[PDB]
């Protein structure tokens, strides 16, 4: 129950992974 994701981290996963999945 730590600091869950957010509106930015959610759609930001595609920038850190770079359309990997």
From Swiss-Prot:
Coiled-coil parts of chain: none
Tissue expression from the record: Expressed in brain (at protein level). Expressed in cerebellar granule neurons (at protein level).
PTM description: May be ubiquitinated by NEDD4L; which would promote its endocytosis.
Annotated site, Important for channel closure, chain positions: 4
Consequence recorded when altering residue 21 to A: Blocks the reduction of Na+ current and the slowing of inactivation caused by PKC
Record's subcellular location: Cell membrane
Residues bearing PTM Phosphoserine: 21
The protein's role, per its UniProt record: Mediates the voltage-dependent sodium ion permeability of excitable membranes. Assuming opened or closed conformations in response to the voltage difference across the membrane, the protein forms a sodium-selective channel through which Na(+) ions may pass in accordance with their electrochemical gradient. Implicated in the regulation of hippocampal replay occurring within sharp wave ripples (SPW-R) important for memory.
Free-text domain note: The sequence contains 4 internal repeats, each with 5 hydrophobic segments (S1, S2, S3, S5, S6) and one positively charged segment (S4). Segments S4 are probably the voltage-sensors and are characterized by a series of positively charged amino acids at every third position.
Subunit relationships: Heterooligomer of a large alpha subunit and a smaller beta subunit. Heterooligomer with SCN2B or SCN4B; disulfide-linked. Heterooligomer with SCN1B or SCN3B; non-covalently linked. Interacts with NEDD4L. Interacts with CALM. Interacts with TMEM233. Interacts with the conotoxin GVIIJ. Interacts with the scorpion toxin BMK M1.
Family note: Belongs to the sodium channel (TC 1.A.1.10) family. Nav1.2/SCN2A subfamily.
Protein name: Sodium channel protein type 2 subunit alpha
Organism classification: Eukaryota, Metazoa, Chordata, Craniata, Vertebrata
């Amino acid at each position: 129950q730590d600091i869950f994701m957010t509106e930015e981290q959610k759609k930001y996963y595609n920038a850190m992974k770079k359309l990997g999945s």
